[PDB]
Design a protein around this ligand. Structure first.
Ligand SMILES: CCCCCCCCCCCCCCCCCC(=O)OC[C@H](COP(=O)([O-])OCC(O)COP(=O)([O-])OC[C@@H](COC(=O)CCCCCCCCCCCCCCCCC)OC(=O)CCCCCCCCCCCCCCCCC)OC(=O)CCCCCCCCCCCCCCCCC
Ligand SMILES: CCCCCCCCCCC(CCCCCCCCCC)(CO[C@H]1O[C@@H](CO)[C@H](O[C@@H]2O[C@@H](CO)[C@H](O)[C@@H](O)[C@@H]2O)[C@@H](O)[C@@H]1O)CO[C@H]1O[C@@H](CO)[C@H](O[C@@H]2O[C@@H](CO)[C@H](O)[C@@H](O)[C@@H]2O)[C@@H](O)[C@H]1O
Ligand SMILES: CCCCCCCCCCC(CCCCCCCCCC)(CO[C@H]1O[C@@H](CO)[C@H](O[C@@H]2O[C@@H](CO)[C@H](O)[C@@H](O)[C@@H]2O)[C@@H](O)[C@@H]1O)CO[C@H]1O[C@@H](CO)[C@H](O[C@@H]2O[C@@H](CO)[C@H](O)[C@@H](O)[C@@H]2O)[C@@H](O)[C@H]1O
Ligand SMILES: CCCCC/C=C/C/C=C/C/C=C\C/C=C\CCCC(=O)O[C@H](COC(=O)CCCCCCCCCCCCCCCCC)COP(=O)(O)O[C@@H]1[C@H](O)[C@H](O)[C@@H](O)[C@H](O)[C@H]1O
Ligand SMILES: CCCCC/C=C/C/C=C/C/C=C\C/C=C\CCCC(=O)O[C@H](COC(=O)CCCCCCCCCCCCCCCCC)COP(=O)(O)O[C@@H]1[C@H](O)[C@H](O)[C@@H](O)[C@H](O)[C@H]1O
Ligand SMILES: CCCCC/C=C/C/C=C\CCCCCCCC(=O)O[C@H](COC(=O)CCCCCCCCCCCCCCC)COP(=O)([O-])OCC[N+](C)(C)C
Ligand SMILES: CCCCCCCCCCCCCCCCCC(=O)OC[C@H](COP(=O)(O)OCCN)OC(=O)CCCCCCCCCCCCCCCCC
Ligand SMILES: CCCCCCCCCCCCCCCCCC(=O)OC[C@H](COP(=O)(O)OCCN)OC(=O)CCCCCCCCCCCCCCCCC
Ligand SMILES: CCCCCCCCCCCCCCCCCC(=O)OC[C@H](COP(=O)(O)OCCN)OC(=O)CCCCCCCCCCCCCCCCC
Lengths: 90, 86, 57, 172, 69, 469, 64, 164
């Protein structure tokens, strides 16, 4: 006995606009390749190669750059340094 | 302090580990209020203070109205189902 | 709690005031508000059961 | 820093974890001799987490002779290792280790407390601008700090010098 | 000829006035914070009329000597 | 006024027929409005933070309780309007939303119980007010006895409330046994230093807090909120929270409590995480309420929490009323009414609402982004004040957890807007029907408050500095 | 300025009336007298807030 | 009429001098201004006007119909109650020295002086014992603060009025 009001008249959602001629000839193989590449994160798994790249780029490389950047802080001063003078401050 | 405490704790455990019936549940509620009140009244006597007994009287009255409302709720619950299977 | 309490007498009480009289005294004067709020609580204890156990009309 | 007694504290933690796992098992039973049969190993969960956390925390604190959040980071790493061994998968084990270690390191960094250390808090501390020449405390602020403090804290170089350049390079 | 900026002195004066208002707000802010943590009188914080904290108990069996200051 | 209203209303509802329910409720709506506007000037009593003890030191009156009182009247006005006025005049809505005969009296009595909880200066008054509110709210849960879920809900509520009331009474009596007193006013810094009341006071706080459903005892309340009629849920999920929280804030008996700290943390985590997998609207909103109750619980760990708590409770009341009203309005555009007590149940039933009513979705967006805390909506300033307080008092880890919990809860807040701005195939073409003017105006007023309240922030703080300092 | 506060509060009232018209699926100017009514009411509330705030400032200054 | 307990003297609840800390019901109604009667009249008119306007905005049964006489009579009754509560509150606030009270202050000074001339008690003689008078005072003092919740009045001739 519980039904929406008869007073309501519902029509279609049409989006309007001019249907242009279809200027691209879709290739199903390319679309599937694109979809696989686009949503690669949904299927990523930790393996030996993937873990190796992770531990290289997220750990080893930052550690190298951090050691360089904290070891060399304030080390060099070059402005107008002349012969015999030390370009190093420590 | 002793009789009231034990009534409270045993009624509480009866309430919690009830897996028999809902009437046991009502009864554990009432008996908990009993034990609370007995502890209260012993303390009232030991202090020779009237505030304890005043609160005991108020608990009595409120337990009365609580029992009335609770049984009314149970009856309204029963009206739809015809049977309490707990 | 093994020790025994000393029960002592004194004569400062000339009235026949018991527990019931003192409860009446405090409840009706020092705590008249608690009494009237209890009246409202009993009013609830009347209205509620009628409201949920009776089907009007 | 005077040492934690690692052996004793770990033993008490073993006892507490065993009791807690027992309580969890009893509950689990009631909510579902079979209690330990259908326990799901919760007694082991509690016992192992307790021993791992406490033993690693005391061990690290004693070895480094410090008390700070890093000890909690190590202890959380050990606890996560224990909890992630249950998955029986290397990625999940590593993930539990590193993430529980990070979470507990954050916890230890903030003070290793859930409530607050009231005396150290801002509301109970000297605040506002300091008086004539007083030393800066954690919550206080000035208009100028002493240059020696800058040189000691930040360190020499990269434009940090004992003397302003123009003053030092003035001719006479 | 079309550039008509305000004078430098006027800009400095206006910004100094703004900063002064800001410092006034900072001082009022710190002030209110201190005043909220000071303690009020019993009349202001509990009861204006009947401002005596000392109780008087029951009056039926009033025993000489029960009063203690 | 409230007692006089209750008495008169009992007389009238006795002597009136079942068809006069909505007219009676309109009468009380206007009466409460009249009281709110004509008696507001009593604020002036509270100038300089003047406190008054009344009724023989049973009740306490200060600016804080006056404000909570006004807020509770505003909430009652809004809630009674939903019953006193029809959304639409069709048969379906006569079936959907009809007020019971005694509902209004129960509402007023529960409001009285809440006001007495707020003002309570003595434990006997606290306990009597708690029991008054608890009984009235049991009955409000149970008054729609044709619903199987509502009756089951009322019974579960009766039992859980009874156990928590016994815990509360036990705490009160232990406090009596140690101090031979029923007032917290007897407590002092010397007494707290001298004696270890921590266990008793925390038991009292926990007994009060488990009644508004803080973790780990949440689920029974969320189930009750789910299983009640929607116009009942709009009320029972709000008023007890306000009364209990306001009492606890005013009392300040758990300052720097380690147990409350851990339970507030747990409540935040459970309210945020547990609401993610929800598909029913009212369960989503109940977990919202749990997270917000956590935000307010944090304020019980510190002194001088009046401003942050008042601001937060006011903006939360407004946002909560508004979101429930929006869900109510969106009922007219659903194509399936689930039943007569809860017409809409699943979030996905709002799908494509923007195509049916664009501005309803605008209002929905505004309220949701208030809940998430996007400035300059009110929700942002509420969270800002709370963070200010807790960081001033050194709750660093709790602040980090609060950040994380707001982030997590944003997901199931935006779930609503997400499904609401998606597209539905059958789009309203036309309708002669007009939504009721009054409720639409009220919903609009709430929305405009949430949107443009921030322009009055500095004026509000100036007023606050003279009434609460 | 009091006049500015009244204009602003009336603007809030107009906003409420407009949002109410749109929420009823009605034209913006559906019932133009409602705009006047809501503007007057919200201007009243703004005036009340203004008077209270001014009194508060007066009290704060008088304790000096 | 001798006080049993010590009270504050001429305490400032506001910016104006104190007339009476706990005024008697007869005084509070007796000192009411024509503006307060205007308030009573406004509430009495407003409440049924409110119900009628509410019916205009959103008719109960689709079609406008003027509210029945029962409801209008109700409306007048409750509106008068609200108006009287508001007016009583205004007068009491004058008594505490929270609103402007020059007229009330002068009238009180004159009335008290006349009563003193007649030899009567400044606050009247009570049929209660002093303990019950202190209890009645502690029950009625500042009870106007809870006007929103419950109505409570001073009907007892006690001596705790906070003056000299
Ligand atoms: C109020 C409106 C109704 C007024 C009725 C008459 C008023 C009057 O003129 O009093 C003159 C009357 C006689 O004047 P008098 O001869 O010049 O004596 C001078 C001194 O009073 C002499 O004082 P005294 O110290 O010498 O003597 C002590 C004092 C004893 O006084 C007390 O102890 C009073 C203490 C109780 C406080 C009551 C406050 C009201 C509380 C309302 C409910 C609160 C519940 C909260 C729940 C949460 O006086 C008495 O001994 C009188 C004893 C009782 C008299 C008969 C009892 C009548 C009760 C029912 C009356 C129904 C009236 C008609 C219908 C209306 O003064 C009284 O003391 C009589 C008591 C007053 C009536 C009590 C309750 C009235 C109705 C309840 C309130 C309803 C609220 C409705 C409006 C709400 C806001 C809009
Ligand atoms: C460190 C030491 C880890 C040493 C173990 C290496 C490890 C972890 C890598 C995680 C990296 C962490 C990085 C995170 C950040 C670091 C800061 C990745 O080992 C991977 O090696 C790859 C290459 O060899 C494989 O990819 C492809 O494989 C071939 C398919 O054709 C191709 O030959 C190859 O060409 C492909 O490429 C993966 O399948 C393999 O998992 C796990 O390897 C081993 O551990 C065990 C136990 O869990 C795993 O489960 C086992 O096998 C399951 C049924 O199989 C059952 O459950 C069960 O029988 C058993 O339990 C296995 O996974 C196992 O193999
Ligand atoms: C954006 C990322 C957020 C994550 C980072 C937040 C973590 C904050 C850490 C910083 C901080 C609060 C700062 C909060 C500032 C604003 C908060 C920021 C936003 C909050 C989200 C917590 O400092 C904690 O550090 C932990 C170690 O990690 C310690 O753990 C524990 O260690 C062991 C117990 O002794 C146990 O074994 C165990 O219990 C734990 O092991 C804690 O005891 C310690 O309180 C430091 O606060 C404190 O610092 C000290 C001296 O600094 C201040 O006093 C000073 O006294 C003199 C010297 O003392 C100075 O001469 C004087 O000048 C100054 O008066 C204090 O006044 C106070 O202020
Ligand atoms: C209806 C049901 C009716 C049933 C009735 C029967 C039950 C009766 C008792 C149960 C009552 C209800 C139980 C409630 C839970 C109990 C937990 C509880 O209160 O919080 C604790 C109790 O802190 C104890 O020190 C107390 C320690 C606990 C006592 C020891 C445990 C004994 C078990 C032995 C085996 C309160 O410390 P807290 O948070 O303030 O913690 C800190 C700290 O204590 C202080 O140092 C700080 O200064 C302070 O700022 C604070 O932050
Ligand atoms: C500080 C924060 C405190 C308060 C802030 C909240 C609100 C602002 C204060 C006061 C609000 C008072 C507003 C009164 C003026 C508002 C107003 O135009 O009339 C109403 C709404 O009227 C309330 O529904 C009046 C209900 C009042 C309840 C509002 C409370 C929210 C809207 O007009 P409307 O054109 O749709 O009304 C028309 C017309 O009246 C009928 O004749 C037509 O037949 C019908 O179609 C209808 O559409
Ligand atoms: C003609 C009479 C009509 C008055 C009816 C009042 C009804 C209250 C209903 C709901 C509460 C809704 C908002 C309350 C406003 C706080 C007032 C105040 O200023 O808060 C202060 C205390 O600040 C606080 O703690 C913080 C309050 C948190 C407010 C959060 C929302 C902020 C945005 C709201 C913007 C206002 C809209 C104006 C649009 C033009 C109390 O002020 P007070 O105790 O001195 O009383 C005021 C004088 N009064 C009685 C005549 C009205
Ligand atoms: C978008 C989402 C963005 C999220 C951003 C990340 C949020 C947090 C993620 C998890 C990070 C966990 C951090 C654990 C750090 C472990 C630790 O114990 O820190 C303590 C360390 C030293 O603290 P202390 O005791 O005061 O010693 C002083 C010696 N100078 O204190 C430190 O010195 C800091 C160590 C960590 C530095 C920052 C790490 C990244 C942030
Ligand atoms: C939020 C609070 C709502 C307050 C809105 C203020 C009033 C809008 C001002 C502009 C205006 O009044 O123009 C009138 C115009 C008429 O539109 P309509 O109702 O459809 O009438 C014509 C059809 N007969 O009305 C309009 O069409 C303008 C509607 C504007 C309302 C919001 C726009 C949609 C969301 C915009 C996102 C930006 C939000 C703020 C960021 C800045
Ligand atoms: C004789 C009976 C019939 C006539 C009634 C006689 C009554 C006399 C007074 C009538 C009202 C005049 C005073 C208030 C102005 C309201 C005018 C109005 O109708 O709405 C203004 C505007 C819509 O105006 P309109 O051009 O009609 O658009 C309709 C569809 N496009 O809507 C808007 O602009 C909304 C803007 C609101 C937010 C603005 C905030 C900025 C301040």
């Amino acid at each position: 006995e519980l039904k929406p009001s008869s007073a309501i008249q519902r029509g279609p959602l049409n989006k309007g606009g001019w249907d242009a001629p279809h200027a691209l000839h879709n290739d199903g193989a390319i679309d599937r390749y694109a979809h696989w590449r686009t949503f690669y994160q949904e299927r990523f798994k930790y393996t030996r190669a993937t873990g190796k790249s992770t531990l290289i780029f997220l750990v080893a490389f930052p550690a190298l750059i951090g050691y360089v950047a904290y070891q060399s802080e304030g080390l060099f001063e070059f402005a107008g340094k002349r012969r015999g003078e030390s370009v190093t401050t420590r | 302090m002793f009789i009231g405490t034990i009534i409270l704790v045993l009624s509480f455990l009866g309430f919690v580990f009830n897996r028999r019936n809902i009437i046991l549940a009502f009864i554990c509620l009432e008996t908990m209020l009993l034990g609370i009140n007995l502890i209260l009244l012993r303390n009232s006597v030991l202090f020779d203070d009237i505030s304890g007994s005043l609160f005991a009287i108020v608990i009595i009255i409120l337990a009365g109205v609580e029992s009335a409302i609770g049984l009314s709720l149970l009856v309204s619950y029963y009206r739809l189902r015809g049977v309490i299977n707990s | 709690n093994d020790y025994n309490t000393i029960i002592t007498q004194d004569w400062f009480n000339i009235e026949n005031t018991t527990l019931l009289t003192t409860i009446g005294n405090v409840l009706l004067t020092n705590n008249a508000f608690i009494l009237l709020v209890l009246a409202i609580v009993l009013l609830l204890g009347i209205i509620g059961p009628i409201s949920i156990t009776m089907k009007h009309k | 820093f005077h040492p934690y007694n690692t052996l004793g504290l770990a033993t008490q933690s073993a006892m507490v974890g065993l009791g807690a796992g027992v309580v969890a098992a009893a509950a689990r039973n009631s909510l579902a001799l079979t209690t330990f049969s259908k326990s799901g190993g919760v007694v082991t969960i509690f016992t192992g987490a307790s021993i791992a956390y406490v033993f690693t925390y005391c061990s690290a604190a004693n070895l480094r002779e410090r008390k700070d959040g890093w000890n909690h980071m190590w202890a959380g790493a050990a606890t996560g290792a224990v909890l992630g061994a249950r998955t029986k998968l290397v990625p999940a084990f590593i993930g539990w280790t590193v993430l529980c270690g990070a979470a507990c390191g954050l916890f230890g960094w903030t003070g290793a407390r859930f409530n607050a250390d009231r005396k150290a808090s801002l509301e109970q501390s000297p605040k506002g601008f300091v008086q004539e020449d007083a030393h800066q405390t954690f919550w206080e602020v000035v208009h100028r700090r002493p240059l020696s403090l800058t040189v000691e804290q930040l360190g020499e170089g990269r434009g940090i010098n004992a003397v302003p350049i123009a003053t030092a390079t003035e001719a006479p | 000829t079309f550039f008509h900026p305000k004078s430098r002195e006027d800009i400095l004066n206006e910004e100094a006035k703004i900063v002064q208002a800001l410092n006034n707000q900072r001082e009022l802010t710190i002030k209110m914070h201190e005043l909220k943590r000071e303690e009020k009188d019993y009349a202001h914080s509990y009861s204006p009329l009947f401002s005596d904290p000392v109780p008087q108990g029951g009056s039926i069996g009033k025993a000489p000597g029960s009063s203690r200051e | 006024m409230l007692i006089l209203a209750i008495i008169s209303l009992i007389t009238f509802v006795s002597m009136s027929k079942l068809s006069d329910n909505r007219a009676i409720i309109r009468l009380i709506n206007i009466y409460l409005i009249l009281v709110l506007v004509l008696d507001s000037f009593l604020y002036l009593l509270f100038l300089n933070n003047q406190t008054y003890t009344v009724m023989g030191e049973l009740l306490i009156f200060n600016s804080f309780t006056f404000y909570i009182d006004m807020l509770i009247y505003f909430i009652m006005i809004v809630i009674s309007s939903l019953y006193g006025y029809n959304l639409y005049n069709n048969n379906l809505y006569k079936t959907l939303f009809e007020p019971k005969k005694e509902l209004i009296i129960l509402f007023l009595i529960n409001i009285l119980g809440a006001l007495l909880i707020v003002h309570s200066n003595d434990f006997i008054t606290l306990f009597v007010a708690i029991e008054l509110q608890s009984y009235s709210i049991y009955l409000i849960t149970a008054i729609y006895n044709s619903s199987y879920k509502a009756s089951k809900a009322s019974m579960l509520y009766f039992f859980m409330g009874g156990i928590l009331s016994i815990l509360i009474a036990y705490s009160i009596n232990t406090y009596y046994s140690v101090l031979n007193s029923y007032t917290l006013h007897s407590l002092d810094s010397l007494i707290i230093n001298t004696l270890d009341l921590n266990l008793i006071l925390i038991a009292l706080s926990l007994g009060l807090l488990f009644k508004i459903g803080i973790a780990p005892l949440h689920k029974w309340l969320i189930s009750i909120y789910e299983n009640t009629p929607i116009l009942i849920t709009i009320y029972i999920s709000l008023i007890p929270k306000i009364s209990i929280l306001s009492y606890l804030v005013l009392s300040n008996i758990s300052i720097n409590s380690l147990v409350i700290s851990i339970l507030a943390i747990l409540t935040l985590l459970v309210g945020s995480v547990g609401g993610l997998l929800q598909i029913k609207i009212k369960r989503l909103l109940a977990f919202s309420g749990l997270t917000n109750a956590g935000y307010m619980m944090l304020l019980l760990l510190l002194n001088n929490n009046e401003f942050s708590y008042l601001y937060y409770i006011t903006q939360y009341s407004i946002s909560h009323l508004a979101i429930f009203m929006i869900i109510i309005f969106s009922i007219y555009y659903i194509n399936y009414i689930n039943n007569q007590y809860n017409p809409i149940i699943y979030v996905n039933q709002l799908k494509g609402l923007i195509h049916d009513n664009a501005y309803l979705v605008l209002s929905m967006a505004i309220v949701v982004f208030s809940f998430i805390g996007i400035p300059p909506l009110l929700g942002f300033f509420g969270k800002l004040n709370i963070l200010m307080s807790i960081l001033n008092n050194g709750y660093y880890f709790i602040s980090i957890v609060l950040i994380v919990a707001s982030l997590i809860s944003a997901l199931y807040y935006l779930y609503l807007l997400n499904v609401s701005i998606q597209d539905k195939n059958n789009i309203l073409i036309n309708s002669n029907e007009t939504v009721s003017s009054v409720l639409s105006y009220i919903l609009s007023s709430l929305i405009i408050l949430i949107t443009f309240g921030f322009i009055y922030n500095s004026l509000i703080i100036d007023i606050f500095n003279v009434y609460f300092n | 300025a009091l006049f500015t506060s009244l204009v602003g509060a009336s603007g809030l009232g107009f906003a409420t009336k407009f949002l109410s018209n749109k929420i009823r699926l009605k034209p913006a100017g559906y019932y133009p007298l409602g705009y006047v009514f809501s503007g007057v009411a919200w201007a009243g509330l703004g005036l009340v807030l203004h008077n209270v705030h001014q009194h508060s400032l007066e009290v704060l200054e008088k304790k000096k | 009429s001798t006080p049993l307990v010590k009270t504050s003297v001429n305490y400032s609840y506001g910016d104006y001098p104190l007339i009476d800390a706990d005024p008697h019901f007869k005084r509070v109604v007796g000192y009411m201004r024509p503006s307060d009667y205007g308030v009573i009249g406004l509430a009495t008119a407003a409440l049924p006007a409110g119900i009628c306007f509410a019916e205009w905005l959103d008719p109960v049964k689709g079609k406008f119909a003027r509210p029945s006489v029962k409801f209008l009579r109700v409306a007048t009754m409750l509106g008068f109650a609200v108006g009287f509560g508001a007016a009583y509150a205004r007068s009491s606030l004058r008594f505490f020295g929270v609103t402007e009270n020059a007229r009330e202050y002068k009238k009180d000074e004159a009335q008290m002086a006349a009563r003193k001339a007649a030899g009567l008690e400044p606050y009247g003689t009570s049929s209660l014992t002093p303990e019950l008078q202190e209890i009645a005072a502690k029950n009625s003092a500042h009870s106007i603060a809870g006007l929103f919740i419950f109505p409570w009045f001073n009907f007892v001739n006690h001596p705790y009025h906070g003056r000299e």
